[PDB]
Amino acid sequence: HNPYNFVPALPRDGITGDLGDCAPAGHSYYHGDKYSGRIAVKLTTVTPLLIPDASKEEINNNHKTYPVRIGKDGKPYLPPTSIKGMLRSAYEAVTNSRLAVFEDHDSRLAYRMP
Amino acid sequence: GLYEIAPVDLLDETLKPATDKKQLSPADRVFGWVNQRGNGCYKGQLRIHSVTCQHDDAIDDFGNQNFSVPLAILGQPKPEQARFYCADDRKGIPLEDGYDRDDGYSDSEQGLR
Amino acid sequence: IVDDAVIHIPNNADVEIREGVGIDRHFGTAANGFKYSRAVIPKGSKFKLPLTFDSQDDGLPNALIQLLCALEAGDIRLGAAKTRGLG
RNA sequence: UAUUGACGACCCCGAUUGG
Numbered sequence: 001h002n003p004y005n006f007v008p009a010l011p012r013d014g015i016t017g018d019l020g021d022c023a024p025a026g027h028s029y030y031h032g033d034k035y036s037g038r039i040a041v042k043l044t045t046v047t048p049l050l051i052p053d054a055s056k057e058e059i060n061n062n063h064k065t066y067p068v069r070i071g072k073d074g075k076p077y078l079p080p081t082s083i084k085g086m087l088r089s090a091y092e093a094v095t096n097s098r099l100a101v102f103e104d105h106d107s108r109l110a111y112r113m114p
Numbered sequence: 115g116l117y118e119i120a121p122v123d124l125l126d127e128t129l130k131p132a133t134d135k136k137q138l139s140p141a142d143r144v145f146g147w148v149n150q151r152g153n154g155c156y157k158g159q160l161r162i163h164s165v166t167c168q169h170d171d172a173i174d175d176f177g178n179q180n181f182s183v184p185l186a187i188l189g190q191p192k193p194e195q196a197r198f199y200c201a202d203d204r205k206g207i208p209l210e211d212g213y214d215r216d217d218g219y220s221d222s223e224q225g226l227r
Numbered sequence: 228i229v230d231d232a233v234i235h236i237p238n239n240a241d242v243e244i245r246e247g248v249g250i251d252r253h254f255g256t257a258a259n260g261f262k263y264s265r266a267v268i269p270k271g272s273k274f275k276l277p278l279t280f281d282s283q284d285d286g287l288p289n290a291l292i293q294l295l296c297a298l299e300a301g302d303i304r305l306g307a308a309k310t311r312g313l314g
Numbered sequence: 315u316a317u318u319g320a321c322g323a324c325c326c327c328g329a330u331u332g333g
Contacts (some may be wrong), residue, residue: 100147257330
């Protein structure tokens with residue numbers, strides 16, 4: 001198996017309701033029809049997890065070495081941004097939202113003839 | 115050679131990154147959004163916080179700190195591989211086998227995977 | 228009588244600039260135009276207490292004694308932004 | 315008619331409000 005695939009982003013023309021585009025619910029107050037609060041989540045790893053601290057990287061012959069990032073108590077520190085980007089991309093998939101991060105892609109790509 | 119269409123032009127306008135305050139899709143509302151092209155932003159409705167490791171000896175030092183394992187080749191993605199990255203329809207249908215490369219980014223009714 | 232007092236900003240120190248911004252209570256983001264950049268004297272700058280007092284009767288007025296205690300307590304705020312960090 | 319060989323790293327902040 002090729003180690004990557006794609007989930008198909010469907011074009012969202014005529015998507016209505018909450019899965020469609022809407023003016024945002026906003027922060028100014030808690031709405032009677034909408035929910036707020038705190039969710040407790042436990043994460044446990046199944047394959048090993050890489051969390052390289054580039055601030056501590058080391059160089060030999062331009063080959064690079066990274067230690068595991070650690071926090072002020074000496075435990076491995078997991079950047080919540082890295083959790084966020086994981087969850088967001090999974091959320092973007094199962095909600096089929098707009099794709100939040102798209103780079104240049106505006107020039108024609110090149111290829112070679114046989 | 116060049117494929118005749120730039121990949122951004124195969125993507126549906128409703129899927130492209132949001133460009134106004136009204137077209138904020140669900141993930142943009144929950145997680146927040148910033149317009150890359152102009153004014154416009156929204157603070158996400160969500161915060162992740164209080165991350166802790168529960169265990170203490172969680173780090174697999176393989177035995178001594180001078181050891182370090184070498185790790186594959188994390189090559190750069192190369193979307194020139196049209197038979198991988200291009201979609202035969204904007205529903206993400208994979209391209210047909212056997213055709214030449216030129217068939218790739220070739221019609222506006224093509225899509226992206 | 229209250230003379231002017233020049234502020235001795237300490238050694239190797241200079242006026243700081245604070246940034247200030249308004250957050251739109253709906254979107255949670257910087258509100259259009261509501262940005263400002265207040266200059267401030269850094270903490271620990273010194274200046275002379277410049278008071279003089281003329282008494283037409285004997286002793287020192289009791290309320291004026293209270294005021295000096297309030298200054299030793301540091302209870303009196305001065306300048307702008309008194310509610311919001313400074314002074 | 316389809317052969318010729320094997321190498322190589324990349325991104326370094328971006329968009330906006332400035333009273």
